[PDB]
Symmetry: D2
Subunit: 296 residues, 4 copies
């Protein structure tokens, strides 16, 4: 198979189950929403050395579609451990959104996706020291917590689902600039898919790893030397001097497959792309196997 003359390797990305929440952040403006959003979702590329996997889903939610009639942004927070996720929701909303000028936080988990729920807003409400006050807002149960700026509004509870983490593909290109232009076009396409986010910096992984280490028994993971253009022993096609990985997490498998589809199609329009591939673990580790040829 080829898309725009780019070979699509017949292989599969191997994904995993992970717990996920989805939060609507509103603010006085879209600018202040993004300020809160960038803080709340940072230090969140991978659960290996980061405390969560977080990112923006919908970059712009019109005022007339929010509970409070203010501009919004939706983010998603993921972790494989459900208690770790509830902690992360509390810490990230409590110290990155409650503290951010004019920002409010509401649940944006689709009812059809909702399996569990955590009363994060109830928990933060104690910050009001007895002055916090329950209210209803567009049918929603909210807490009004007095803060020095005025009030912080937060929904009582946030829904949790089991989503799909680790959807991926590799872009193989003739050079680093070519691979990066293709990679960013891919991420620009992924922005439009609802219920999916790319947690790595700018959506892009420049240092994909393998499980473990050939040399060091203390390392749980290490550089994927099979795909390192500067490692003399690599398994790369001729004329490939750069590989990028795009990693996608999502509410469900369909959202992750859709993100991968539009990401790959977008990447294949850009010059200097040699091959599209995907990372798996032989079928052994994860719960999902997303075959690239099945996307198209």
């Amino acid at each position: 198979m080829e898309i725009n003359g780019v070979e699509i390797e017949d292989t599969f990305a191997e994904a995993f189950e992970a717990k996920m929440a989805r939060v609507l952040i509103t603010a006085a403006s879209h600018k202040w929403a993004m300020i809160a959003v960038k803080e709340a979702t940072g230090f969140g590329t991978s659960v290996i050395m980061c405390p969560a996997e977080a990112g923006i889903d919908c970059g712009y939610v019109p005022p007339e579609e929010t509970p409070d009639g203010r501009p919004g942004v939706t983010i998603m927070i993921g972790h494989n451990d459900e208690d770790e996720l509830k902690e992360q929701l509390l810490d990230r909303i409590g110290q990155c959104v409650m503290t951010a000028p004019t920002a409010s936080a509401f649940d944006a988990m689709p009812e059809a996706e909702k399996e569990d729920e955590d009363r994060v807003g109830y928990k933060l409400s104690f910050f009001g020291d007895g002055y916090q006050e329950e209210d209803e807002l567009d049918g929603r149960k909210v807490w009004k917590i007095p803060v020095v700026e005025g009030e912080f509004i937060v929904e009582d509870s946030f829904g949790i689902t089991t989503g799909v983490a680790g959807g991926n593909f590799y872009i193989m290109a003739e050079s680093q600039p070519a691979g990066l232009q293709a990679a960013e076009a891919a991420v620009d396409a992924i922005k439009g898919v609802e219920g999916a986010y790319a947690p790595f910096p700018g959506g892009i992984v420049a240092s994909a790893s393998k499980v473990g280490s050939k040399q060091y028994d203390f390392l749980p993971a290490s550089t994927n030397d099979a795909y390192c253009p500067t490692v003399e022993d690599n398994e790369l096609p001729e004329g490939v001097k750069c590989v990028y990985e795009i990693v996608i997490n999502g509410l469900n498998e369909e959202a992750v497959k859709e993100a991968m589809r539009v990401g790959i199609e977008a990447a294949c329009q850009q010059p200097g792309v040699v091959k599209i591939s995907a990372g798996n673990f032989g079928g052994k580790l994860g719960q999902y196997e997303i075959h690239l040829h099945d996307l198209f």
Copy 2:
């Protein structure tokens, strides 16, 4: 004292010692440097519920002033615990900068500030799985760690210093929009001060807290209801309907004093500002007393 008719309260901010690192991130462009910087410095407002206190120091470093001749940005990461700092350096550079497209990481601790150092680059280089190699760049010891993109460059070690955490001032305004416009102007000025950063979202604290809780034995901190304009029995001046706090950390006391001076001056140029104040514990807890009146 008045600045532009705004009363400056005769009081002082009480600040503390905290361990700090200072990292230069370079990339193929300023855009890509900022991508890595925003990931690396997020989830980083307060050591209370976040893993670190992190922020941007210098938003633009010209290519001719970086060791690799590429565009850069300097960030600071801080923590009261030196061991937590070292762990945060490893995690944040390893998962937010090594993974970011084209980004490299160099030490930017001034030689005169350096008290200690940690070989963070050395510890990361094992990711190369035997293929990592030492090199010298602009007289710096660096590791070239082969990655799917090509190579990740990171300086062998990073300097640590005992800096100053928790310099602060309060902006008391006639309304929330007036308060916020004044607050952002203050942060715009602080951006120009070398060696100082404001770790809260957009530099601004919307939810200033107090130690402990009148109602709840289980809270380490709660809303500062003395300054909550919606709390019937607050201690705000007549006319004051919003308070914001700006929190500043820095390499040393002079950096923090300078940031407070230019922050307060800029805030006082904006309309609807009633009073400037600051927070302390009587001088009984912290290592630094910055008297507002001595700034000007």
Copy 3:
């Protein structure tokens, strides 16, 4: 009538016919599309002393909805004079988009709205000095023009329609900061309305004018002193210390009505707003009257 306690004056905005074009700009990334778009729509607030009224309609068009499969943005350019408009399309696309890295220009004038058209692409194609080549891309007739970067792609012709210019409303607020926070919220809402744009800087008019001058024969327009908070004999209601105007242009009356509706709704959610009004000439100059009360 009140919206969130804000009085909506029972009056109407008077709008005019103007010629309008709508252009889709694609590029290697949304970032580079935005680079071209900002240049092409600048110096474009008002036909009084600018060459056109231009702005962004849809800030993000998904790659899979564009003819070339690359990320895009749609903009609109308007003028009351159809011959001026055709010149402005040629100059802005020729100097601002053809020159911009990786940018292509396509027609995005809806078939239903299309009244006339100009072969702007054909006229630009002569830049190829004989090397220009005609092609078809997604059913569209385009020119591929050889340039130093590679090729520039531009559709052969662009639709033109009679749209609606000068839909408006005034936000009357207690202070300049409260007014500006309300006005940006309003513009954030308008961003989401397809076929409407707000040509002034940030969508907001800080210096609303009246026709002619009381003191000067040589002026076509001057400050609207009735609404000037510092003019001792202004017509402002008690408590209003700042007025901002939002001016909206659009493909048709419905897009303008909708933009006014969502803009006013969003402005009224923000604190410190006293009254919404609008400007007219008694119904005796323009082609449209949009009564504010009929919007809700």
Copy 4:
């Protein structure tokens, strides 16, 4: 001569004399300063089909270095014709800055560079309709013009100098993505040079042209087909698949020389750059020849 293995052609850039103004724009925040600046400098790449050549010089000016103590940005506006320049200053400030929320405009022409001046603020002051008031701010003669937001502040007069226009170099690269990565790094360096600006979109020219046309006696200029990679009869080096040009205007020859120097060095750090050249007219047309070998 080579820089980082990149061949520097022993040739010259031929530049011209042009009239130039340098304006400082302040606003309530750097955000609002930039909104006014983007509108004021747009539609301004080339005086061939644009009304002027305009661009950002210093993208951030500290509050303490401005006349009013607010965040600022400095822009430069040029034209070959003094009268056209004065008209562009009036129109761009009047329609794009006076109208922009919170924005003021001050002169930023260095004393030593000042040849002539035009009382632009005086001309705009008549907008006040007799309510405008002369004043002094930090030793500057300014006009306070009542507007619906409050007041517009503009300096009475603005200095004019004869600067240098059309300094330039060509980046020849192996691919379009490689060329564009080199080009943006180049412009990132030029940002740091005071008194110079790059008027094309993103600082970069994707469609460099030659004087006249081989085919069409009605074309004043056409594509430079000598450097067109898709033109069979081009004169490009082996392996060059894309050329970009950077055009640099400045207050004086030195400022232009420095921008070319740091831009070329930055470009040469990036992968896939084959050759640096420059464009001239055989010493025929312009007042300045700037030999690339002399920069280094």
